[PDB]
Design a binder for this molecule. Structure first.
Ligand code: HEC
Ligand code: HEC
Ligand code: HEC
Length: 68
């Protein structure tokens, strides 16, 4: 899709898949080939979502992703 969300317990995490794609390229997330990714709590918080954004914008605590 162009937008997805992980409907997680906290507050659903929107991700403008398309946006990230056209803004960045593809490489950004899908090096070899896309076959899903399945970015969970661990991945997301560790080194996927909540690593990239550091140098781009400052979501300090939360809210950045979880719409809650
Ligand atoms: C990181 C911010 C991403 C960018 C940039 C792109 N994609 Fe992506 N993609 C990403 C995630 C986290 C997911 C998985 C969602 C899940 O359910 O696990 C995906 C998924 C895809 C898929 C699979 C869709 C499906 O029906 O399962 C495809 C085919 C895909 N992505 C392709 C794709 C392309 C072509 C992009 C660059 C041009 C692109 N993605 C960017 C994360 C990210
Ligand atoms: C984007 C950079 C994020 C920010 C900002 C925060 N979180 Fe997050 N979180 C994110 C994703 C993509 C996911 C995936 C959902 C999953 O469970 O795999 C998560 C997940 C969590 C979870 C687990 C929720 C569940 O349903 O089990 C927790 C407990 C969580 N996140 C907490 C949390 C808090 C407290 C934040 C501020 C400190 C926060 N998240 C920010 C993406 C992002
Ligand atoms: C680094 C290449 C990125 C990865 C990997 C992820 N995101 Fe991202 N995100 C990135 C940028 C450059 C931006 C800002 C775009 C702009 O126009 O300036 C964003 C923005 C978001 C947003 C909005 C946050 C805001 O500042 O308003 C969301 C909701 C978001 N990103 C979610 C998200 C998730 C959950 C990711 C892991 C699956 C993720 N992003 C990865 C760059 C990058």
């Amino acid at each position: 899709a162009d937008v997805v969300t992980y409907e997680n317990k906290k507050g659903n995490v929107t991700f403008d898949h398309k946006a990230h794609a056209e803004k960045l390229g593809c490489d950004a997330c899908h090096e070899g080939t896309p076959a899903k990714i399945a970015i969970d709590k661990k991945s997301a918080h560790k080194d996927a979502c909540k690593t990239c954004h550091k140098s781009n914008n400052g979501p300090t605590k939360c809210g950045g992703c979880h719409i809650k």
